[PDB]
Design a protein around this nucleic acid. Sequence first.
RNA 1: UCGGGCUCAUAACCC
RNA 2: AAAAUG
RNA 3: GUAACUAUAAC
RNA 4: GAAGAGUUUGAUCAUGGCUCAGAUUGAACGCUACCGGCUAACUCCGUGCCAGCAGCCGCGGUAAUACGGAGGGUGCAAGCGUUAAUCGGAAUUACUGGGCGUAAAGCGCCUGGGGAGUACGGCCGCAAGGUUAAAACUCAAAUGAAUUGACGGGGGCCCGGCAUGGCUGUCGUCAGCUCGUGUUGUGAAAUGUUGACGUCAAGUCUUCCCGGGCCUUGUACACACCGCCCGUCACACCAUGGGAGUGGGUUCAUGACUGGGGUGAAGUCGUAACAAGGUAACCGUAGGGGAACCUGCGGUUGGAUCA
Lengths: 123, 132, 47, 65, 21, 136
Amino acid sequence: ATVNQLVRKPRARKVAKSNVPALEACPQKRGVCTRVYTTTPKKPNSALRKVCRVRLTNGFEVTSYIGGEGHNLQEHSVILIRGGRVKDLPGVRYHTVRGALDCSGVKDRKQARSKYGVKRPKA
Amino acid sequence: DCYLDIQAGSGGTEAQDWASMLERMYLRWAESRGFKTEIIEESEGEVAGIKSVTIKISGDYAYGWLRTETGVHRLVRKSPFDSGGRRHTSFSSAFVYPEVYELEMQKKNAEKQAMEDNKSDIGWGSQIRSYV
Amino acid sequence: SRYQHTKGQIKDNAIEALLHDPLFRQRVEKNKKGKGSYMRKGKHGNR
Amino acid sequence: ARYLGPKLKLSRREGTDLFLKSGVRAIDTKCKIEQAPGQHGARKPRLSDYGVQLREKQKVRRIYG
Amino acid sequence: KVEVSGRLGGAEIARTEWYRE
Amino acid sequence: ELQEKLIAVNRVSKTVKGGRIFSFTALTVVGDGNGRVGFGYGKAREVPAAIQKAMEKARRNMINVALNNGTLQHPVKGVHTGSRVFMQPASEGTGIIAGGAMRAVLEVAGVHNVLAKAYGSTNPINVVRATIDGLE
RNA sequence: UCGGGCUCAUAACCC
RNA sequence: AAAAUG
RNA sequence: GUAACUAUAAC
RNA sequence: GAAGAGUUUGAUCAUGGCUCAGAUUGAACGCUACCGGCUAACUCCGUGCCAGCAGCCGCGGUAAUACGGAGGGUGCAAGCGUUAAUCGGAAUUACUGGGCGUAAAGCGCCUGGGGAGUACGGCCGCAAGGUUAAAACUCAAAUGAAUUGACGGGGGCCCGGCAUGGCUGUCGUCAGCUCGUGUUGUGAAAUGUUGACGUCAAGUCUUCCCGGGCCUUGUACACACCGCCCGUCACACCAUGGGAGUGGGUUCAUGACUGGGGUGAAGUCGUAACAAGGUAACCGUAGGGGAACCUGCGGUUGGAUCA
C-alpha cells in the first residue's frame, strides 16, 4: 500500500480468464459431433438435457448443449457452437446454434424464432 | 417357469416401502390367475419394507403374461415415514426373465453384455407405468 | 437419443442398472408451509 | 425511421395529453386517456424509480421522434 | 377483532390473516 | 407542503416457537425542497402501517442544510459505518445523478445539481445516513 | 433367522 | 457407568 | 456373508 | 464532470466474490428481441421436475405473470437479438481511492471459497519435511460479528383435506403471547415481558428418568439436534501430478498403472466436528490405525461450568 513499496513491486492486475476457452476468442466455432446424448442436471433440478460432445476445428473436444424442442442431431455431423454456459450441467459451457449448417431449426416454433433458427411463417 | 426380480433404488425408506407394495401386487396377481407364489430369494429393508426379492412364477404361459410387465415403476406419492410430510417420486425395477467350458461361459456373457447395452441405449423407456 | 450411463458397461441387468443411477433419482418436492418451506425471494417477489 | 402504429396508444401509456392527434375531436371524448394501453388498464401499477425516468425520456420521443 | 382464513389474493397456500382492536 | 419519498421496503423476521413472525421495514425521507431534509425508518407487522410510521418518524428529527441555489457549497465526503458517500456540486442543467439511497434524499432536500457515488457498502439504510452526515 | 418389547423410527439391548 | 443413526 | 447392474469386499 | 441492482442469513450488518443494466467492434450467427426479480412491460389455453428455460437468483413435481402457444403490451427500429472481444460499473490490485484483532491479510502481507499452503521446480535438510509457490477444474458461495429462536448427555430457579371454508385434536388449562407509544442500537432486534399467539402444509372433500416454564451461556442448527455433518471404501466421469517412456517443435502431446483432488443420485462403514458433540476443541509435532481420527509432547483460548 505504501508508495515506496509499490515502486519495487507494481500492483499485479488480475488476469481475466475467459469462461469459454475452446472458442479461442471467436464468436462461433464449427465442429463435428462425436457423441450426442442426454444427462441429468445437478442438485434439485430434474430433467434430461440434450448435450453433445463436439470435436472442434482448433483441436479442442468440448461438450455443448442443444436447445429448442425435439432436435434432429446425430453422430458425425457439423455443428456451429457459441458460448454461454449452462448452469444445470457440469462441464457443459457451450450452446448449439440452431439452423446453422447440418443442424436444423426447431419444428413448429412461433415466439423467439430468431434464437432457435426458425423462419417466419406466412400467417 | 419365469423369475421376477423386484429392486428398490435411490431411496432409503421411500423406495423400500414402494418395493414391498409392488411385491404384494405381483403375488396377488399370481394368486388370482392360478400361478405358484414360490419365493426363492428375499431381503427385507434396513428401516422398513423390502430391498430385493426374487419370486418364481410357475404354471401355463408364465412369461407370456409377464412380458410387458417388465420395467421401472414410478410412484408419485406422499411418504408416511418421512417426518417432513413430503411428496416423493420414487422408483422400483421389476426385471422378469425366463428359466434356462470357460470359453463357452465367456461367449455367453459377452452376448449378454451386448444385449443389455442395446436395451439401455434406448433411453429412459424403462419407466413404463406411473402410480399416483 | 441416448443417455450416458454412470454405470458404464452394463453386464447383467439393464433395467436394474438404470434404476441405480441419477436418472431414476429420489426426487424431493419443496413443500410449502412445512419443513424446508421458507422462500426468501418468492416466485414473483413482493409487490 | 418513423412510428407507423397507433398514435393514441403512445398517449395512453404516459397518462397525459401531448397533442399527438390532429385536434378536431377532444382527446378524452374519443379515447380513454386515463386508462393504460391494451388489456391491463383497470389497475394502477406501482412504477419503479427507473420507470419514472424512462417514461420522461419516452415522452420526448413520442412528440418529436 | 376480525379473522379471515383461507385464500386471499388468489394464493395457493391458505392464509390466516387477522386484525385486533 | 413537504415532499415525501420511499427508498426501500425490506421484509425482516423474528423467529419464534411457531415458525416466523414477519415485519416490514420502510425507509422514507421528507423535505420541503429549500434546504431541509430528514430520514425516517419504520417497523410494523403490515406494509401500509410501516410506510406511515416511518414518515411519522421522519417529520421530527430534521436537519438544516445550506445550498448554493439548487446545489452544494463544496465537494463533501460523508461516511457512515461501512458505507462511504462522496458528493460533488455541479452547474445548472446536469440533473440528479446519484444512487437511489442518495438520489431519494437529494430529491426532497432541493438538491438539483449533484454528482454522487457510493463506495464500500451500498446498502440503502446506511447510505441515507451517510448522505445526511455529508450534508451536516 | 423369526415373534414381541424399548424408541418418534432403525440399530444395539431385553424376552 | 450408558444414548450410534435419521 | 455383505455396498449404487455385476465384480470386488473397506466392514 | 462520477447512479446502482440481484445473489450468501430465519432476519441483520458487514466483508467479499459471482452476475447484470452502459459504450464500442475489421465482427460472426439467426431473422427480414423481451414481459418473475434485476430490467420498461400480464392474462388465458396446453404440458405436469416431463418437455423445456436461464446472465445471475432460480422456474416446471396438475390450477406456471419465469416452459410452449395465443392475445395484449414494452423497448429498439431497418434493423433486431444471441455469441465473442475490451473497458466500465469493480474504491473487486485502491497514485487519485482499499486494507491486515476476529471477515483474506503483520517495511511485510491480502485480493472469493475449495483445489492448496498442495502439485512441480529451485533452495535448505541426515531424514521427517520446511521455505518459495501455482495451474486446470469446480461452487455461488465460503466467512466475520452480533440478533431472534430452537436445542445441549451447559448451569440455576421452579412445576406436574398439499386448493379450501367450517369443525376437531395436539403441545396443554401449559402460562405465556405480543401490539402501539417511546428510548437504545447502523441494523436484525432489544427494552417493555428482566382452553391465547400459534405449532404439526395434524384429522375430515426432588438426586435420577419423561415433559413443560423462566433466566443465563455455547452453537458450524433454522428442515431448527428426528438439525447439521467429516472421512475412507464402492461405482462412474472430468481435470490434474508421478510414471518404464515414446514422438514432435527446454517445452507440447501421449503412456499401462497409480497418487491426491473434484463432481456425483437422504449407497456401505462408522460418527470425527458444531452443545462440557457426550474424551473441550484446535495448532505444531511424532507414533499408530479401515476411516473420520486416536494418543504422547508442548502451546492456545477462538472451551463450558464454577454449584
